[PDB]
Structures are given as C-alpha cells and as structure tokens.
Scaffold this active site. Structure first.
Site, PDB file in Angstrom:
ATOM      1  N   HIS A  15       2.801 -13.345  -5.083  1.00 11.46           N
ATOM      2  CA  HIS A  15       4.051 -13.572  -4.350  1.00 11.46           C
ATOM      3  C   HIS A  15       4.048 -14.620  -3.255  1.00 11.46           C
ATOM      4  O   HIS A  15       5.066 -14.787  -2.572  1.00 11.46           O
ATOM      5  CB  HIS A  15       4.516 -12.263  -3.720  1.00 11.46           C
ATOM      6  CG  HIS A  15       4.716 -11.165  -4.715  1.00 11.46           C
ATOM      7  ND1 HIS A  15       5.589 -11.266  -5.773  1.00 11.46           N
ATOM      8  CD2 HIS A  15       4.120  -9.951  -4.818  1.00 11.46           C
ATOM      9  CE1 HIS A  15       5.540 -10.149  -6.483  1.00 11.46           C
ATOM     10  NE2 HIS A  15       4.653  -9.349  -5.928  1.00 11.46           N
ATOM     11  N   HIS A 128       3.011  -5.092  -1.264  1.00 11.98           N
ATOM     12  CA  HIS A 128       3.959  -5.186  -2.375  1.00 11.98           C
ATOM     13  C   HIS A 128       5.199  -5.927  -1.933  1.00 11.98           C
ATOM     14  O   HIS A 128       5.648  -5.769  -0.797  1.00 11.98           O
ATOM     15  CB  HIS A 128       4.326  -3.778  -2.884  1.00 11.98           C
ATOM     16  CG  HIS A 128       5.310  -3.767  -4.014  1.00 11.98           C
ATOM     17  ND1 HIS A 128       5.031  -4.302  -5.252  1.00 11.98           N
ATOM     18  CD2 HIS A 128       6.578  -3.289  -4.088  1.00 11.98           C
ATOM     19  CE1 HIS A 128       6.080  -4.148  -6.043  1.00 11.98           C
ATOM     20  NE2 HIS A 128       7.031  -3.535  -5.359  1.00 11.98           N
TER      21      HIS A 128
END
EC number: 3.1.27.-
Lengths: 133, 133, 133, 133
Positions: A15, A128
């Site tokens: 990410h 996350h």
C-alpha cells in the site's frame, strides 16, 4: 502475509509506493505471494512515516472490518493509485491484468503495536489499509 | 533529482526496496527520470528507518565523493540487489537492460537535514548512497 | 518528573546547563519539585543537540539502571558541574546545600521517542542521565 | 557577547529558560558578563529548537533594530518572564535588583547562519531577541 515480512512491512509492500508502475506491473509484487490474483488494491503515494503519523489520529471503528476499532483516518488527502482486476478468469497470476485508477483520497488504516523486528522509531505501526474516503 | 521528490524521497526511490523486481524492471522507475540509463544502481533491501539510523553513526569521508565528509557507514550488512547496465549502446531508455547481482553488504550514505516537505519523524535523512562494502 | 515537563524537558532542566550557578543555587530549580533534596546531580555544560547526537550512538546496557538497554555513551567528554548534597539532615528543601565538583567526563544517557509536546526537530530524545565516566 | 559562546549560545543564555528563577537571581547569569546591569531582559519559557523553527517563518524588518530584515515572528505566543531593572544606581552588578513581569507574548528573533561550533542540526539559528509582541 508472507512470513518474510512484519505486518508493517507487508502493509508497506501492498500500500505504499511513491511512484508505482501501472497496476498490471505493480500488482505482480503482491500477487507473487498469493494463490489467486488480488481483486483490488490501493497504493498510497506517500511515505511510511506519514502513515505512522496517521496512527496517532483519533481511533475509530474500522469501516470495512467492523470488529476492529483500531483504525485511524488521515487528516488530509493523498495521491494514490487504485488497481482493479479486469480478468478474474484465473489461469496463472502472471496473466492477471488490472485497470488503473489514479486518484486523491483520505485513507483509513488499522494500527497496532510494532513487531520486535520493526524499528523502535515507531511504537505503533500501520498493519492494514482498511479503506479510502 | 526530479523536482517531484525531495532528496530523501529520491534516495528511497533509487536505493530502498524490500522486494525489488529484477533489475531490468526495477531500473525503469529510475531511468524514466534520466536523459541516459544509469550505469549501476544498488537497491538496499531494508527500511528507511534503518538507513536513518546509519545517519547517526560516526561521520566519515565519503569514499566515492571525497569532497564530502557527511557520510556514515552501516554497522551491519543488509541484503541488497545490485544492478549493472549491460547495453550502454541502448537506443532508448525503454530498452536498457541490467545484470542482476543479489548480495549482502555494508553500505555508506551521505546524510543531511530534511526538506520541509519530508516527514518530521526524521530531521536527518539519507540523501545519497555513496557506496557499499 | 513534574507534569509541567516532558521527559526530555525535565532531562534538560536537571542535566543541561551551559553556565550553571554554584550547586546550592542550581539545585533549587530541581529540588523545588521534590519531596526531599536530591542526593547528587550532574549538569552537563553542553547543548541539547549534542546530547541528542549521543542517542544515535551504539545502544548499551544502562550502567546504573541495568534493567534498561536503551543507553548510549558519548564519544567525547564534556565539561560539567557535579553537585553533592552535604546536609541530608536539612530541615527544608530551601536549606539544602551542595558541594561543587567541576569536571570533564564522558556521559551515558537513556533515550526514547519524543513526547507529542516536544519539538519535532528531535524524534529521539535523552530522558535520563544514567551516569558519567 | 562573551567569546566563550557562539551567538546562538549567548542568545539561549539570555533568552531561553524553561523555568527561570525570579529576575533578581536569573539576571546574575547575564550581568556577570557585563560592565553594568542590563536594563531589561526577557526569558522565553520555551526550547531552543522551538525558536529555531521560528527562524523558518517569514523574514521581516526587525522592529527594534531596523537596519536588519533577518527577523522572524513566532506563529504563537509563549509564556515568558520579563525582567526590569529597578535600581540603575550602579555600584556593583551583584547589587542589581529586578522587577518580575510574567507574561505570554509572540516574539521576534533575528536569525543568521550558524557558527561552525553550532550543531549542523540547525543551519540557521536565533542570534538576538529583537522584541516581544
């Protein structure tokens, strides 16, 4: 998560990319570790340190993963690249192709205490990418 | 350095990659910003935080840029991927190809005070990979 | 530590003074915040920045607080003023008196990540003077 | 300025004190270096690093010292202690007494390139407290 990486490192692999290649290329880095190609993925065009700072923001209910309330929303929007799988028709992960969606959004991350292998410079780390707003 | 990036960001783009693709792919990210393909480049398989730690090591003469003495040698070796240009007679930067040399070495970085646009988490940042040992 | 100060600020109040008054005066600043007068205290005649540099030195076991290994030994000696309580039978903290011992020594500090209220110029700060050498 | 100190160090001695004693005591530290007692002086209850950050603010005309335009106004107010000489009647500097005026004000500092003896952590440093607002 591949055992070679801490949760924070795997978060960064999936990410964080200051200058990602187009999704069909960028996604290979993740899909090599997978049984099947990932349906969607967002790369934030920022730095790990910037995301760690977001871990210091107000804790909120995680929008996707609503059993968790260790999520944190960025104060500002960041440039990003969203990747959407266009051929879920399987065969091999080397064959997966993605649609590119550049954008600029707030993001929400789940943060946890660091792995002993993570730098002591960040007691709390993103683990996350819950969603973008 | 491209103006889109601070010196620290450009350092990270060129020299920090936890899981780089093979050099011919990895080097495109760099060479897109150059007139000519880079003759050699090392990607350290580590984190930005770990490199910042090296900045706090004893200051030394920069081995490859000997007008500078703001260099710092790592205390431990890190896994890395070294890339060597194999076709300097390349027509376009799109066609440059590299030989891959995985390794594990100490490294030497030059460090400087951060750019206003860099994260405040690191007032002192690596700005150049001087050499590896 | 008084709540008015971060750990780094309290470190500076106790242990950083470029030009301290004699110990009996200098120690009042500290003892005002204490139940009883401090038995001993060293003021380093240096700057906060120089002490922060020490935080980047090799991590070692804390000599005087051996449950901790976030200590760091200076690379050079600094001038200092050591203060020793000479009347522990003192009625009130106002009456505590100290013997003065100017010196020049290496020092060992424990360092930790900064407090949100500390300047972003130093993400890692001294929080305790463990000993001098 | 006493030769023992860089301009930045002398600035800090005169104008930075997280927890100063009352002015009659605090001012001794400065007046020991003077022929005659200083008429007035302000101690900012902040840190050197905080003031260095103000050096990064917009450069302005120095309100007192109007031949200079290397001044910088703080974005926020800081607690401070102002000291006003009450007995200009000379004799010895040990005899000077000061009125105390605690307050909270913006400040304006002149900033310059650092002394080679100042830490490379601050390329630019405060060298004079021009005024408070």
């Amino acid at each position: 998560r591949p055992p070679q990486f801490t949760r924070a490192q795997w978060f960064a692999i999936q990410h964080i990319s200051l200058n990602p290649p187009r999704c069909t290329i960028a996604m290979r880095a993740i899909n090599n570790y997978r049984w099947r190609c990932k349906n969607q993925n967002t790369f934030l065009r920022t730095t790990f340190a910037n995301v760690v700072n977001v871990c210091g923001n107000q804790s909120i209910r995680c929008p996707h993963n609503r059993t968790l309330n260790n999520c944190h929303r960025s104060r500002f929007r960041v440039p990003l690249l969203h990747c959407d799988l266009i051929n879920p028709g399987a065969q091999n992960i080397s064959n997966c192709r993605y649609a590119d969606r550049p954008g600029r959004r707030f993001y929400v991350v789940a943060c946890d205490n660091r792995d002993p292998r993570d730098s002591p410079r960040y007691p709390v780390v993103p683990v996350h990418l819950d969603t973008t707003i």
